[PDB]
Tab-separated table of C-alpha atoms in Angstrom:
chain	number	residue	atom	x	y	z
A	1374	UNK	CA	21.164	3.069	22.399
A	1375	UNK	CA	22.978	6.015	24.033
A	1376	UNK	CA	26.241	7.527	22.780
A	1377	UNK	CA	28.550	10.375	23.718
A	1378	UNK	CA	30.428	12.688	21.386
A	1379	UNK	CA	33.685	11.616	19.720
A	1380	UNK	CA	32.280	8.080	19.629
A	1381	UNK	CA	31.980	5.398	16.949
A	1382	UNK	CA	28.728	3.553	16.197
A	1383	UNK	CA	28.533	0.196	14.406
A	1384	UNK	CA	25.517	0.078	12.080
A	1385	UNK	CA	24.165	-3.379	11.232
A	1386	UNK	CA	21.373	-4.163	8.764
A	1387	UNK	CA	19.699	-7.543	8.234
A	1388	UNK	CA	18.380	-7.353	4.657
A	1389	UNK	CA	18.094	-10.804	3.053
A	1390	UNK	CA	16.252	-9.227	0.106
A	1391	UNK	CA	19.389	-7.376	-1.032
A	1392	UNK	CA	21.560	-10.531	-1.138
A	1393	UNK	CA	21.440	-10.391	-4.924
A	1394	UNK	CA	24.352	-12.767	-5.588
A	1395	UNK	CA	25.671	-15.548	-3.363
A	1396	UNK	CA	29.280	-15.170	-4.565
A	1397	UNK	CA	29.212	-11.343	-4.542
A	1398	UNK	CA	29.288	-9.211	-1.398
A	1399	UNK	CA	26.212	-7.063	-1.982
A	1400	UNK	CA	26.057	-3.362	-1.144
A	1401	UNK	CA	23.322	-0.877	-0.242
A	1402	UNK	CA	23.172	2.901	-0.074
A	1403	UNK	CA	25.408	3.410	-3.112
A	1404	UNK	CA	22.857	4.872	-5.544
A	1405	UNK	CA	20.041	7.392	-5.262
A	1406	UNK	CA	17.514	4.677	-6.148
A	1407	UNK	CA	18.609	2.762	-3.014
A	1408	UNK	CA	19.833	5.431	-0.581
A	1409	UNK	CA	21.153	5.162	2.957
A	1410	UNK	CA	20.475	8.309	4.982
A	1411	UNK	CA	22.361	8.835	8.231
A	1412	UNK	CA	21.461	12.015	10.071
A	1413	UNK	CA	21.659	13.885	13.365
A	1414	UNK	CA	19.456	16.749	14.597
A	1415	UNK	CA	21.197	19.260	12.361
A	1416	UNK	CA	23.691	17.258	10.294
A	1417	UNK	CA	23.420	14.356	7.860
A	1418	UNK	CA	25.398	12.307	5.342
A	1419	UNK	CA	24.047	11.318	1.928
A	1420	UNK	CA	24.647	8.136	-0.087
A	1421	UNK	CA	26.442	6.084	2.562
A	1422	UNK	CA	27.485	2.658	1.299
A	1423	UNK	CA	26.989	-0.433	3.452
A	1424	UNK	CA	28.737	-3.746	2.828
A	1425	UNK	CA	27.675	-7.333	3.458
A	1426	UNK	CA	29.619	-9.034	6.242
A	1427	UNK	CA	29.787	-12.257	4.231
A	1428	UNK	CA	29.421	-13.224	0.598
A	1429	UNK	CA	26.129	-15.065	1.247
A	1430	UNK	CA	25.065	-13.902	4.717
A	1431	UNK	CA	22.422	-11.252	4.006
A	1432	UNK	CA	23.653	-8.910	6.763
A	1433	UNK	CA	25.151	-5.488	6.017
A	1434	UNK	CA	27.624	-3.874	8.413
A	1435	UNK	CA	29.327	-0.479	8.551
A	1436	UNK	CA	30.391	2.084	11.113
A	1437	UNK	CA	30.372	5.880	11.338
A	1438	UNK	CA	32.350	8.001	13.805
A	1439	UNK	CA	30.699	11.078	15.328
A	1440	UNK	CA	33.327	13.821	15.095
A	1441	UNK	CA	31.413	16.300	17.247
A	1442	UNK	CA	31.826	20.059	16.961
A	1443	UNK	CA	34.973	22.146	17.363
A	1444	UNK	CA	33.275	25.029	19.229
A	1445	UNK	CA	33.874	23.668	22.736
A	1446	UNK	CA	36.783	23.461	25.188
A	1447	UNK	CA	36.117	19.965	26.506
A	1448	UNK	CA	39.633	19.616	27.934
A	1449	UNK	CA	39.302	22.974	29.703
A	1450	UNK	CA	42.789	24.177	28.754
A	1451	UNK	CA	41.312	27.313	27.165
A	1452	UNK	CA	41.423	26.564	23.423
A	1453	UNK	CA	39.034	25.089	20.869
A	1454	UNK	CA	39.752	22.243	18.455
A	1455	UNK	CA	39.228	19.399	20.935
A	1456	UNK	CA	37.095	17.555	18.351
A	1457	UNK	CA	37.753	17.736	14.602
A	1458	UNK	CA	34.215	18.616	13.570
A	1459	UNK	CA	33.864	17.440	9.977
A	1460	UNK	CA	31.013	15.821	8.033
A	1461	UNK	CA	32.447	13.653	5.257
A	1462	UNK	CA	32.708	10.091	4.010
A	1463	UNK	CA	30.763	8.002	1.503
A	1464	UNK	CA	32.199	4.490	1.872
A	1465	UNK	CA	31.235	1.833	4.414
A	1466	UNK	CA	34.080	2.572	6.851
A	1467	UNK	CA	35.177	6.221	6.440
A	1468	UNK	CA	31.993	8.010	7.525
A	1469	UNK	CA	32.535	11.182	9.557
A	1470	UNK	CA	29.665	13.102	11.152
A	1471	UNK	CA	29.426	16.226	13.285
A	1472	UNK	CA	27.221	15.922	16.357
A	1473	UNK	CA	26.296	18.333	19.138
A	1474	UNK	CA	26.704	17.319	22.775
A	1475	UNK	CA	22.885	17.041	22.934
A	1476	UNK	CA	21.731	15.446	19.676
A	1477	UNK	CA	20.174	12.298	18.247
A	1478	UNK	CA	21.366	9.789	15.652
A	1479	UNK	CA	18.993	8.628	12.915
A	1480	UNK	CA	19.692	5.883	10.363
A	1481	UNK	CA	17.133	5.284	7.608
A	1482	UNK	CA	17.078	2.392	5.129
A	1483	UNK	CA	14.912	1.969	2.028
A	1484	UNK	CA	13.808	-1.431	0.714
A	1485	UNK	CA	11.310	-0.184	-1.900
A	1486	UNK	CA	10.264	3.159	-3.339
A	1487	UNK	CA	8.189	5.315	-0.963
A	1488	UNK	CA	8.980	2.846	1.849
A	1489	UNK	CA	11.693	3.428	4.443
A	1490	UNK	CA	12.714	1.737	7.698
A	1491	UNK	CA	14.481	3.968	10.216
A	1492	UNK	CA	16.564	3.610	13.346
A	1493	UNK	CA	17.107	6.060	16.172
A	1494	UNK	CA	19.719	6.869	18.804
A	1495	UNK	CA	20.426	9.643	21.299
A	1496	UNK	CA	23.501	11.638	22.323
A	1497	UNK	CA	24.257	12.685	25.909
A	1498	UNK	CA	27.254	13.278	28.162
B	868	UNK	CA	38.788	-4.601	-31.447
B	869	UNK	CA	36.719	-4.612	-34.651
B	870	UNK	CA	35.264	-8.085	-34.059
B	871	UNK	CA	32.525	-8.518	-31.461
B	872	UNK	CA	34.447	-11.425	-29.865
B	873	UNK	CA	37.338	-9.280	-28.622
B	874	UNK	CA	39.135	-10.674	-25.550
B	875	UNK	CA	37.179	-13.929	-25.962
B	876	UNK	CA	38.557	-17.413	-26.543
B	877	UNK	CA	38.033	-18.511	-30.130
B	878	UNK	CA	38.669	-17.065	-33.587
B	879	UNK	CA	38.582	-13.587	-35.098
B	880	UNK	CA	35.841	-14.575	-37.550
B	881	UNK	CA	32.444	-14.234	-35.891
B	882	UNK	CA	28.818	-14.228	-37.041
B	883	UNK	CA	25.869	-12.980	-34.993
B	884	UNK	CA	23.103	-15.544	-34.464
B	885	UNK	CA	20.210	-16.207	-32.095
B	886	UNK	CA	22.511	-18.027	-29.640
B	887	UNK	CA	25.093	-15.235	-29.430
B	888	UNK	CA	28.427	-14.991	-31.243
B	889	UNK	CA	29.829	-17.821	-33.349
B	890	UNK	CA	33.445	-17.024	-32.460
B	891	UNK	CA	32.843	-16.833	-28.697
B	892	UNK	CA	34.133	-19.961	-26.936
B	893	UNK	CA	34.990	-18.984	-23.342
B	894	UNK	CA	34.628	-15.741	-21.385
B	895	UNK	CA	35.580	-14.612	-17.877
B	896	UNK	CA	33.292	-12.114	-16.150
B	897	UNK	CA	33.681	-9.984	-13.028
B	898	UNK	CA	30.301	-8.916	-11.614
B	899	UNK	CA	28.686	-10.521	-14.689
B	900	UNK	CA	30.703	-8.139	-16.900
B	901	UNK	CA	33.230	-9.458	-19.414
B	902	UNK	CA	36.843	-8.677	-18.511
B	903	UNK	CA	38.367	-6.900	-21.516
B	904	UNK	CA	41.396	-4.663	-21.981
B	905	UNK	CA	40.732	-1.030	-22.989
B	906	UNK	CA	41.562	-0.516	-26.660
B	907	UNK	CA	40.277	1.068	-29.842
B	908	UNK	CA	38.588	4.452	-30.058
B	909	UNK	CA	35.884	3.647	-27.468
B	910	UNK	CA	38.221	3.820	-24.442
B	911	UNK	CA	38.510	7.629	-24.307
B	912	UNK	CA	36.315	7.905	-21.197
B	913	UNK	CA	38.045	9.319	-18.118
B	914	UNK	CA	35.317	8.982	-15.481
B	915	UNK	CA	35.175	11.196	-12.404
B	916	UNK	CA	38.847	12.202	-12.810
B	917	UNK	CA	41.003	13.313	-15.741
B	918	UNK	CA	42.899	10.000	-15.989
B	919	UNK	CA	41.902	7.437	-18.608
B	920	UNK	CA	41.251	3.831	-17.606
B	921	UNK	CA	44.185	2.507	-19.645
B	922	UNK	CA	46.501	5.182	-18.239
B	923	UNK	CA	45.224	4.431	-14.729
B	924	UNK	CA	45.973	0.726	-15.196
B	925	UNK	CA	49.438	1.552	-16.549
B	926	UNK	CA	50.136	3.807	-13.554
B	927	UNK	CA	48.926	1.087	-11.175
B	928	UNK	CA	51.464	-1.283	-12.751
B	929	UNK	CA	48.815	-3.825	-13.790
B	930	UNK	CA	50.078	-5.354	-17.032
B	931	UNK	CA	47.180	-7.852	-16.885
B	932	UNK	CA	44.785	-5.303	-18.363
B	933	UNK	CA	42.726	-8.044	-20.026
B	934	UNK	CA	42.443	-11.697	-20.939
B	935	UNK	CA	44.646	-11.237	-24.001
B	936	UNK	CA	47.314	-9.434	-21.979
B	937	UNK	CA	47.689	-12.396	-19.606
B	938	UNK	CA	48.201	-14.777	-22.529
B	939	UNK	CA	45.561	-17.134	-21.142
B	940	UNK	CA	45.011	-19.973	-23.615
B	941	UNK	CA	43.438	-23.416	-23.397
B	942	UNK	CA	45.854	-26.335	-23.785
B	943	UNK	CA	44.898	-30.007	-23.809
B	944	UNK	CA	46.241	-32.155	-20.980
B	945	UNK	CA	47.417	-34.830	-23.422
B	946	UNK	CA	47.259	-35.934	-27.033
B	947	UNK	CA	43.786	-37.488	-26.663
B	948	UNK	CA	42.762	-36.646	-23.084
B	949	UNK	CA	40.020	-34.269	-24.219
B	950	UNK	CA	40.407	-32.053	-21.130
B	951	UNK	CA	41.716	-28.507	-21.581
B	952	UNK	CA	43.502	-26.629	-18.793
B	953	UNK	CA	44.028	-22.871	-18.736
B	954	UNK	CA	45.000	-20.407	-16.052
B	955	UNK	CA	45.733	-16.753	-15.295
B	956	UNK	CA	46.395	-14.487	-12.314
B	957	UNK	CA	43.628	-12.239	-10.970
B	958	UNK	CA	44.672	-8.567	-11.184
B	959	UNK	CA	44.139	-6.158	-8.316
B	960	UNK	CA	42.605	-3.527	-10.625
B	961	UNK	CA	40.360	-4.051	-13.645
B	962	UNK	CA	38.514	-1.759	-16.047
B	963	UNK	CA	34.749	-2.255	-16.124
B	964	UNK	CA	33.017	-2.258	-19.509
B	965	UNK	CA	30.420	0.518	-19.612
B	966	UNK	CA	28.263	-1.213	-22.241
B	967	UNK	CA	28.515	-4.413	-24.285
B	968	UNK	CA	26.064	-3.307	-27.003
B	969	UNK	CA	28.744	-1.845	-29.307
B	970	UNK	CA	31.954	-3.032	-30.957
B	971	UNK	CA	34.654	-2.225	-29.941
B	972	UNK	CA	33.519	-2.172	-26.299
B	973	UNK	CA	33.160	1.218	-24.619
B	974	UNK	CA	35.035	1.034	-21.320
B	975	UNK	CA	34.437	2.983	-18.129
B	976	UNK	CA	36.726	5.882	-17.298
B	977	UNK	CA	37.833	4.595	-13.887
B	978	UNK	CA	39.097	1.236	-12.665
B	979	UNK	CA	37.847	-0.605	-9.589
B	980	UNK	CA	39.415	-3.174	-7.292
B	981	UNK	CA	38.290	-6.730	-8.052
B	982	UNK	CA	38.068	-7.801	-4.393
B	983	UNK	CA	34.614	-8.924	-3.305
B	984	UNK	CA	33.343	-9.141	-6.880
B	985	UNK	CA	32.289	-12.557	-8.160
B	986	UNK	CA	34.492	-14.014	-10.899
B	987	UNK	CA	32.452	-16.129	-13.316
B	988	UNK	CA	33.501	-18.070	-16.406
B	989	UNK	CA	31.297	-19.079	-19.330
B	990	UNK	CA	32.297	-21.904	-21.673
B	991	UNK	CA	30.159	-21.823	-24.820
B	992	UNK	CA	29.289	-25.442	-25.656
B	993	UNK	CA	28.508	-25.823	-29.361
B	994	UNK	CA	27.170	-29.378	-28.898
B	995	UNK	CA	25.600	-30.616	-25.654
B	996	UNK	CA	24.849	-34.268	-24.851
B	997	UNK	CA	21.766	-34.132	-27.093
B	998	UNK	CA	23.947	-32.278	-29.609
B	999	UNK	CA	22.955	-28.626	-29.370
B	1000	UNK	CA	24.058	-25.368	-27.765
B	1001	UNK	CA	23.831	-25.226	-23.961
B	1002	UNK	CA	25.369	-22.372	-21.952
B	1003	UNK	CA	27.339	-23.675	-18.949
B	1004	UNK	CA	29.685	-21.884	-16.567
B	1005	UNK	CA	31.001	-21.766	-13.012
B	1006	UNK	CA	31.058	-19.118	-10.288
B	1007	UNK	CA	33.631	-17.962	-7.742
B	1008	UNK	CA	34.400	-14.926	-5.593
B	1009	UNK	CA	37.562	-12.832	-5.294
B	1010	UNK	CA	38.248	-12.990	-1.556
B	1011	UNK	CA	39.955	-10.258	0.452
B	1012	UNK	CA	41.296	-10.062	4.002
C	796	UNK	CA	67.535	-13.430	12.353
C	797	UNK	CA	63.743	-13.235	11.932
C	798	UNK	CA	62.810	-10.512	9.434
C	799	UNK	CA	66.447	-9.567	8.699
C	800	UNK	CA	67.729	-13.074	7.947
C	801	UNK	CA	69.832	-13.414	4.766
C	802	UNK	CA	67.282	-13.927	1.995
C	803	UNK	CA	68.108	-14.845	-1.605
C	804	UNK	CA	65.825	-13.471	-4.319
C	805	UNK	CA	65.120	-14.940	-7.753
C	806	UNK	CA	62.503	-13.836	-10.261
C	807	UNK	CA	60.761	-16.444	-12.388
C	808	UNK	CA	58.238	-16.671	-15.210
C	809	UNK	CA	55.544	-18.953	-13.838
C	810	UNK	CA	53.494	-21.483	-15.752
C	811	UNK	CA	50.657	-18.947	-15.915
C	812	UNK	CA	52.946	-16.326	-17.483
C	813	UNK	CA	53.437	-13.785	-14.676
C	814	UNK	CA	56.903	-12.816	-13.430
C	815	UNK	CA	56.279	-13.827	-9.837
C	816	UNK	CA	59.359	-13.923	-7.574
C	817	UNK	CA	60.463	-16.897	-5.496
C	818	UNK	CA	62.647	-16.348	-2.445
C	819	UNK	CA	64.176	-18.332	0.401
C	820	UNK	CA	65.911	-17.253	3.597
C	821	UNK	CA	68.045	-18.913	6.261
C	822	UNK	CA	68.943	-17.463	9.648
C	823	UNK	CA	72.605	-16.733	10.418
C	824	UNK	CA	72.671	-16.286	14.201
C	825	UNK	CA	75.682	-15.864	16.443
C	826	UNK	CA	77.031	-18.051	19.240
C	827	UNK	CA	78.350	-17.314	22.728
C	828	UNK	CA	82.056	-18.132	22.705
C	829	UNK	CA	83.106	-20.470	25.520
C	830	UNK	CA	86.760	-20.769	26.555
C	831	UNK	CA	87.956	-23.209	29.205
C	832	UNK	CA	91.072	-25.018	30.392
C	833	UNK	CA	91.536	-28.779	30.583
C	834	UNK	CA	92.295	-28.818	34.327
C	835	UNK	CA	91.496	-26.768	37.415
C	836	UNK	CA	95.128	-26.733	38.605
C	837	UNK	CA	98.419	-26.845	36.716
C	838	UNK	CA	102.031	-27.544	37.640
C	839	UNK	CA	105.153	-25.842	36.293
C	840	UNK	CA	105.435	-26.542	32.548
C	841	UNK	CA	102.182	-28.520	32.668
C	842	UNK	CA	101.414	-27.691	29.003
C	843	UNK	CA	98.147	-25.832	29.502
C	844	UNK	CA	95.811	-25.955	26.491
C	845	UNK	CA	93.145	-23.375	25.628
C	846	UNK	CA	89.990	-24.709	23.964
C	847	UNK	CA	87.839	-22.020	22.331
C	848	UNK	CA	84.478	-23.135	20.923
C	849	UNK	CA	82.784	-20.388	18.895
C	850	UNK	CA	81.488	-21.122	15.400
C	851	UNK	CA	81.384	-17.464	14.311
C	852	UNK	CA	85.180	-17.247	13.945
C	853	UNK	CA	85.184	-19.799	11.100
C	854	UNK	CA	85.610	-17.603	8.014
C	855	UNK	CA	86.230	-20.404	5.497
C	856	UNK	CA	85.021	-23.996	5.247
C	857	UNK	CA	88.027	-24.837	3.034
C	858	UNK	CA	91.089	-23.306	4.702
C	859	UNK	CA	92.134	-23.865	8.308
C	860	UNK	CA	91.325	-20.748	10.326
C	861	UNK	CA	94.193	-19.525	12.514
C	862	UNK	CA	94.832	-16.579	14.829
C	863	UNK	CA	98.386	-15.401	15.481
C	864	UNK	CA	99.692	-13.339	18.409
C	865	UNK	CA	100.617	-9.678	17.988
C	866	UNK	CA	104.303	-8.809	18.481
C	867	UNK	CA	104.505	-5.009	18.311
D	1085	UNK	CA	56.853	-18.300	-1.493
D	1086	UNK	CA	58.466	-15.073	-2.679
D	1087	UNK	CA	59.411	-11.558	-1.674
D	1088	UNK	CA	56.515	-9.134	-1.205
D	1089	UNK	CA	56.422	-5.423	-0.383
D	1090	UNK	CA	53.577	-3.079	0.557
D	1091	UNK	CA	53.698	-0.792	-2.484
D	1092	UNK	CA	50.455	1.086	-1.770
D	1093	UNK	CA	51.215	4.805	-1.659
D	1094	UNK	CA	50.982	6.398	1.807
D	1095	UNK	CA	48.874	3.563	3.232
D	1096	UNK	CA	50.576	3.781	6.653
D	1097	UNK	CA	50.513	6.912	8.823
D	1098	UNK	CA	52.604	7.261	11.990
D	1099	UNK	CA	51.589	10.060	14.342
D	1100	UNK	CA	51.916	11.241	17.942
D	1101	UNK	CA	48.944	12.771	19.773
D	1102	UNK	CA	48.941	14.741	23.041
D	1103	UNK	CA	45.319	15.493	23.884
D	1104	UNK	CA	43.677	17.854	21.398
D	1105	UNK	CA	46.854	18.366	19.324
D	1106	UNK	CA	48.345	15.882	16.869
D	1107	UNK	CA	51.592	15.592	14.914
D	1108	UNK	CA	52.405	13.076	12.168
D	1109	UNK	CA	55.848	11.476	11.990
D	1110	UNK	CA	55.596	10.522	8.325
D	1111	UNK	CA	54.153	8.153	5.753
D	1112	UNK	CA	55.013	4.613	4.688
D	1113	UNK	CA	54.260	2.428	1.686
D	1114	UNK	CA	55.263	4.830	-1.085
D	1115	UNK	CA	58.752	5.315	-2.497
D	1116	UNK	CA	61.245	6.607	0.056
D	1117	UNK	CA	61.557	10.385	-0.179
D	1118	UNK	CA	62.779	13.345	1.842
D	1119	UNK	CA	60.254	15.473	3.699
D	1120	UNK	CA	59.491	17.493	6.800
D	1121	UNK	CA	57.165	16.910	9.754
D	1122	UNK	CA	53.536	18.030	9.493
D	1123	UNK	CA	51.402	19.062	12.475
D	1124	UNK	CA	47.825	17.791	12.546
D	1125	UNK	CA	47.888	17.004	8.830
D	1126	UNK	CA	47.629	20.678	7.881
D	1127	UNK	CA	49.881	20.350	4.815
D	1128	UNK	CA	47.611	19.353	1.942
D	1129	UNK	CA	50.519	18.478	-0.352
D	1130	UNK	CA	51.659	14.956	0.518
D	1131	UNK	CA	54.981	15.093	-1.360
D	1132	UNK	CA	56.441	17.359	1.351
D	1133	UNK	CA	55.992	14.679	4.047
D	1134	UNK	CA	58.820	12.317	4.946
D	1135	UNK	CA	58.436	8.817	3.497
D	1136	UNK	CA	60.005	5.732	5.081
D	1137	UNK	CA	59.753	3.601	1.936
D	1138	UNK	CA	58.017	0.311	1.279
D	1139	UNK	CA	57.729	-2.190	4.115
D	1140	UNK	CA	59.447	-5.544	3.594
D	1141	UNK	CA	57.865	-8.924	4.291
D	1142	UNK	CA	59.367	-10.683	7.309
D	1143	UNK	CA	59.244	-14.166	5.738
D	1144	UNK	CA	58.453	-15.362	2.197
D	1145	UNK	CA	55.344	-17.233	3.424
D	1146	UNK	CA	54.273	-14.999	6.332
D	1147	UNK	CA	52.469	-12.010	4.814
D	1148	UNK	CA	53.562	-9.702	7.661
D	1149	UNK	CA	55.524	-6.564	6.758
D	1150	UNK	CA	57.825	-4.814	9.238
D	1151	UNK	CA	59.294	-1.312	8.975
D	1152	UNK	CA	61.921	0.054	11.368
D	1153	UNK	CA	61.443	3.747	12.191
D	1154	UNK	CA	63.261	5.780	14.844
D	1155	UNK	CA	61.623	8.660	16.725
D	1156	UNK	CA	63.725	11.580	17.930
D	1157	UNK	CA	63.012	13.412	21.179
D	1158	UNK	CA	62.100	16.440	19.033
D	1159	UNK	CA	59.395	14.603	17.033
D	1160	UNK	CA	56.391	15.658	19.073
D	1161	UNK	CA	53.718	18.323	19.497
D	1162	UNK	CA	54.788	21.803	20.532
D	1163	UNK	CA	54.516	22.679	24.219
D	1164	UNK	CA	55.746	25.400	26.561
D	1165	UNK	CA	57.051	22.891	29.125
D	1166	UNK	CA	60.049	22.185	26.867
D	1167	UNK	CA	61.354	25.765	26.672
D	1168	UNK	CA	64.010	24.786	29.236
D	1169	UNK	CA	66.140	23.567	26.306
D	1170	UNK	CA	66.918	25.776	23.300
D	1171	UNK	CA	66.540	22.740	21.076
D	1172	UNK	CA	68.492	22.398	17.838
D	1173	UNK	CA	66.387	20.469	15.326
D	1174	UNK	CA	68.140	18.035	12.997
D	1175	UNK	CA	67.172	18.680	9.384
D	1176	UNK	CA	65.063	16.012	7.689
D	1177	UNK	CA	65.169	17.657	4.245
D	1178	UNK	CA	68.189	18.215	1.997
D	1179	UNK	CA	69.337	21.385	3.757
D	1180	UNK	CA	72.007	21.181	6.458
D	1181	UNK	CA	70.479	23.897	8.643
D	1182	UNK	CA	69.443	23.264	12.235
D	1183	UNK	CA	66.443	25.615	12.219
D	1184	UNK	CA	62.919	24.550	13.151
D	1185	UNK	CA	61.605	24.757	9.577
D	1186	UNK	CA	64.230	22.245	8.408
D	1187	UNK	CA	62.585	19.388	10.337
D	1188	UNK	CA	58.964	20.586	10.595
D	1189	UNK	CA	56.631	22.047	7.984
D	1190	UNK	CA	56.014	25.097	10.196
D	1191	UNK	CA	57.910	26.757	13.006
D	1192	UNK	CA	56.934	26.159	16.607
D	1193	UNK	CA	54.762	28.695	18.397
D	1194	UNK	CA	56.607	31.406	20.309
D	1195	UNK	CA	57.397	30.170	23.801
D	1196	UNK	CA	56.849	26.527	22.808
D	1197	UNK	CA	59.047	23.764	21.410
D	1198	UNK	CA	58.343	20.432	19.746
D	1199	UNK	CA	58.859	17.546	22.174
D	1200	UNK	CA	57.269	14.470	23.750
D	1201	UNK	CA	56.033	14.445	27.353
D	1202	UNK	CA	55.132	11.645	29.734
D	1203	UNK	CA	51.731	10.116	29.054
D	1204	UNK	CA	51.690	10.995	25.352
D	1205	UNK	CA	49.926	8.477	23.116
D	1206	UNK	CA	51.789	6.963	20.162
D	1207	UNK	CA	49.455	5.702	17.439
D	1208	UNK	CA	49.872	4.043	14.038
D	1209	UNK	CA	47.389	4.564	11.196
D	1210	UNK	CA	47.019	2.045	8.367
D	1211	UNK	CA	44.464	2.376	5.556
D	1212	UNK	CA	43.583	-1.046	4.162
D	1213	UNK	CA	42.919	-0.751	0.400
D	1214	UNK	CA	40.664	-3.830	0.617
D	1215	UNK	CA	39.086	-5.245	3.772
D	1216	UNK	CA	36.900	-8.359	3.843
D	1217	UNK	CA	34.366	-6.159	2.013
D	1218	UNK	CA	36.940	-5.022	-0.562
D	1219	UNK	CA	36.858	-1.295	0.201
D	1220	UNK	CA	38.775	1.317	2.174
D	1221	UNK	CA	39.213	0.604	5.881
D	1222	UNK	CA	41.176	2.310	8.665
D	1223	UNK	CA	42.739	0.375	11.552
D	1224	UNK	CA	44.611	1.834	14.514
D	1225	UNK	CA	46.946	0.680	17.265
D	1226	UNK	CA	48.024	2.868	20.169
D	1227	UNK	CA	50.932	3.039	22.600
D	1228	UNK	CA	51.547	5.345	25.559
D	1229	UNK	CA	54.801	7.107	26.391
């Protein structure tokens, strides 16, 4: 529920409705019709794919790493660049997100048009 | 490429009927899409990059660009066994067909890795037990570690 | 030994039609040479014999391997 | 039951990290080629990075690939603690010069030299072209000097 910066979060989704094929590992968040929206309080990633853990399990799993922001000397040595602040990634495993030291994670999932289920998290020291 | 039954088991001659194609005997499908090698004048698509699907497959070293490339043919087990056995190796990269509504098929401009996709076969049975056309096939998945 | 063991390689056209390779390997490890004398004590002209057991010095299964003494 | 090699281009990354600074030793999986040492992955062009070649399978039925790579005492992030030695850097490219640019993509900062200190973390980066979900995946293992 609570994360720090330069941390990785495992996102799990239990969506039996999207298990379209038993012999095919289904995916969500790939298209604009079925989007996955991960977001902080200032940064977000669009069209983030999520992958089923099993071929016929109905559970989708993926992780995103919070890269933080480069405008801080966390180590205290006197130079920036302690965290490679970069927002990128569209697959299920290569998501990179920038996050302030005081921020909040938000993951939103859509199962039908004009309907969205969301999840929340917070960022502290 | 001219015939609608390209990359399908059967014969070049083919007539279109209510039950599909006359010359279509057996097909192999990845993600419910027929696996066919890019050919003809409908494979000029390049996708998100400037590399064509056929050129991408050639660069990847995948000589199994389609069913015909693998040489997959049905051979009877014996003289009068009545059971046909055929085999091929699953390629790492395959070219998805953009649309099956035109002949020759128009292929997508980029290849995708077959892992995770479901590999399905479809044997077209001209005469079922009652003696008519029934569509039967099997399903399997391309596993990855 | 292990990953560096002598491995023979041979391509082959399989029944499916692909040119899959088939390979086999066998380890060729070394042995700790042990040299000992037949007796703990020897008299004058007791005909001492040196027995050296070390399989790595065999360089031919056909010919008899010998080792002379340097005179120079 | 045959020889296999990891032929995926630049799938393995070997790097050394000391706190907020990182240096990459090279790349593995592609064809062996000459190259220099990049710091923090700043060099966009990948052809200028040293390549260790394709990893070889340990046993015909094992599936595990091993690559032997040696790390010099100079292959590390730049620091001012190593100015005690006016280090001569062995060239990794085709030139025979002993200058800093021969081994590294860029020269060391004034008053600092490339080296490895106690407590530095040695990490290996491998990008799986197909995980159990058949997509890109990054796995890491770490060691401490």
